[PDB]
Amino acid sequence: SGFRKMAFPSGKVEGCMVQVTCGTTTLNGLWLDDVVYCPRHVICLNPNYEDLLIRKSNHNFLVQAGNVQLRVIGHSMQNCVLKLKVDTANPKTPKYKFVRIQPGQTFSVLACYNGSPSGVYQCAMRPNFTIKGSFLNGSCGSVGFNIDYDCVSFCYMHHMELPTGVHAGTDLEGNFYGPFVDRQTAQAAGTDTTITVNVLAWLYAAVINGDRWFLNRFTTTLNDFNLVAMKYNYEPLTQDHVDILGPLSAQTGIAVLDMCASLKELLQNGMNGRTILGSALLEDEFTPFDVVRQCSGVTFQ
Amino acid sequence: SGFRKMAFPSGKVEGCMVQVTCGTTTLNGLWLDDVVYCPRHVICLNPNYEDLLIRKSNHNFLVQAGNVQLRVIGHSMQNCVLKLKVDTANPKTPKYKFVRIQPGQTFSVLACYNGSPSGVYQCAMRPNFTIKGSFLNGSCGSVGFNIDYDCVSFCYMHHMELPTGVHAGTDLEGNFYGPFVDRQTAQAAGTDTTITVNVLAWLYAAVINGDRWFLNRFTTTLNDFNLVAMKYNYEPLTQDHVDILGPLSAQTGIAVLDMCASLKELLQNGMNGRTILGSALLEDEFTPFDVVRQCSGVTFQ
Numbered sequence A, B: 001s002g003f004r005k006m007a008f009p010s011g012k013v014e015g016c017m018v019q020v021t022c023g024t025t026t027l028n029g030l031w032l033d034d035v036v037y038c039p040r041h042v043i044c045l046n047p048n049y050e051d052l053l054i055r056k057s058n059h060n061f062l063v064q065a066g067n068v069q070l071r072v073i074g075h076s077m078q079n080c081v082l083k084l085k086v087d088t089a090n091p092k093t094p095k096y097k098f099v100r101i102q103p104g105q106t107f108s109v110l111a112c113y114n115g116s117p118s119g120v121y122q123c124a125m126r127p128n129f130t131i132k133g134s135f136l137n138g139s140c141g142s143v144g145f146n147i148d149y150d151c152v153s154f155c156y157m158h159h160m161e162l163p164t165g166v167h168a169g170t171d172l173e174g175n176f177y178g179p180f181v182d183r184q185t186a187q188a189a190g191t192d193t194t195i196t197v198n199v200l201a202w203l204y205a206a207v208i209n210g211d212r213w214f215l216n217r218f219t220t221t222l223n224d225f226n227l228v229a230m231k232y233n234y235e236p237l238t239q240d241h242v243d244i245l246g247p248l249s250a251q252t253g254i255a256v257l258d259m260c261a262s263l264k265e266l267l268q269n270g271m272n273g274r275t276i277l278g279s280a281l282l283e284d285e286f287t288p289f290d291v292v293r294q295c296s297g298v299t300f301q
């Protein structure tokens, strides 16, 4: 037992991480098969990458996997991502997919500098298409991922920080999450919201781990729950979020609307100085799947 | 910028993780060089391992690294750890040390089942020689580690859970942290304490990341700070903990006793519903070194 902020093992991703320099500008790339993927920002207020890209040649790109230099035999741009075709297929290429995720979904970040992995942590795509990361100068090209079965689902590539100390990036087809651009013109995320379905998933993790004080005798309708939830800046709970909470409901024998009723009381009356899984806030960066993986799914590894 | 619960990349450790079965009892082992290390519990209320061990032979031990079977050519016991000598030196053996850590120090856990890595999270050795982990049936032989430079410092091997949903384990010489034994006789951890020096390290991370509301004009002596801290179940701050807070003090230009003064006000007056780095509790599972690594040290990777 126990409940931690658990990331996926990073090894399969560490084997794909390389350094990409265009002239003397350096950041991280992802080396899968023939191709290295990195932010197009490497080739540079309001730049015209289309032209900067064509004005470049394959000798303007130095890619190193540790010691070894990868010979760049072509370069192409797709959205905000650069793709460099190289002589060599990465022999440590795992099984993988490029996946575009929805707000509320979680993933692991391997933070990289100079093409070398320095750390792992768990993130959520926030409702405002931001992530709350930890990224410094040189982190761009760091990727987010889930390990779906034997298979790395890459969902995020790091591009920038906004003034609130929050972070923005693309899918691996180089399309931004949310309304952001890879240029240093004033942009802002706008107000975030709490991920209702993830908080309920985490009250279910708390019960599974024997933290039960917050449970009550009451029930609620979906509309009476949302009427309270949206006052406290929580996303409305949708029938579909009730649906995917079904398996955690059956395991615990606590009906989703009864957990809603317990959540409603917590929001109106606070914690009374008590904690839930060693937290004084309701946590919203665990999904239903995250709870089932950590609390049991993990033993079949 | 940003501050997350950051683990070390797990790849170097994933390359050492193997499955160890003695007859039909299965758990995780650590494959470094000639040797696989695992809990002696694999060879089994109050067992006599010395005898159970001798009554065993090298064909009673099946070790698999993925597909490949490792031929066991000898077995030996050191404290609570089994060491199996094998035909083959692990070709993915990283540079490593066995290190015994002190309460307050943090490390990364690679949680393993069936010899396969399933997750990574960050832990602290608690003052009561417990860790707050996430471990199920089959997790034993999962290791804790720091990556000190190029070098994996292995500090923990998982052995058991106590009734409070907390966890106990050994160094890699198989000596327990704290007063615990690898037998299913009633043991208990006893009351824990808050790691004063880590909380101050994390108020320094908060300032570095521009979270500054809690700072005040006041100062305090060490004794007046401890007089308040120990009321709230915090370890007394020692001159030596003031010492290792020096580099974070100079970087932020906030004197350690001024941060102490700010901590004293937080403990006496609470948060007023405000948060610090998105937390409503003072966090004590970041050390001084952890703050410097995440906030800057990481870019030299």
Ligand SMILES: *[C@@H](CC(=O)OCC)[C@H](C[C@@H]1CCNC1=O)NC(=O)[C@H](CC(C)C)NC(=O)[C@@H](NC(=O)OCc1ccccc1)[C@@H](C)OC(C)(C)C
Pocket: A025, A026, A027, A028, A041, A042, A135, A136, A137, A138, A139, A140, A141, A158, A159, A160, A161, A162, A163, A167, A181, A182, A183, A184, A185, A186, A187, B001
């Ligand atoms: C990755 C770049 C890299 O590795 O390249 C080295 C060659 C970094 C990651 C940033 C660094 C700081 N923390 C991170 O996560 N990315 C960048 O530096 C971005 C470059 C591209 C956008 C070209 N720039 C920023 O992230 C920038 N944000 C920004 O300017 O955009 C919005 C904006 C808001 C107000 C005013 C103007 C623009 C950062 C560095 O700027 C701050 C002030 C928001 C921190």
Ligand SMILES: *[C@@H](CC(=O)OCC)[C@H](C[C@@H]1CCNC1=O)NC(=O)[C@H](CC(C)C)NC(=O)[C@@H](NC(=O)OCc1ccccc1)[C@@H](C)OC(C)(C)C
Pocket: A001, B025, B026, B027, B028, B041, B042, B135, B136, B137, B138, B139, B140, B141, B158, B159, B160, B161, B162, B163, B167, B181, B182, B183, B184, B185, B186, B187
């Ligand atoms: C690792 C064993 C493994 O993988 O072997 C498979 C062959 C597990 C890890 C535990 C499982 C549950 N969560 C964990 O972290 N280790 C064990 O099962 C321990 C075996 C050795 C001690 C022989 N047993 C326990 O952890 C046990 N604790 C315990 O009995 O010790 C103190 C005690 C307290 C009260 C009464 C008697 C003894 C757990 C399983 O028992 C509970 C009730 C404390 C959960």
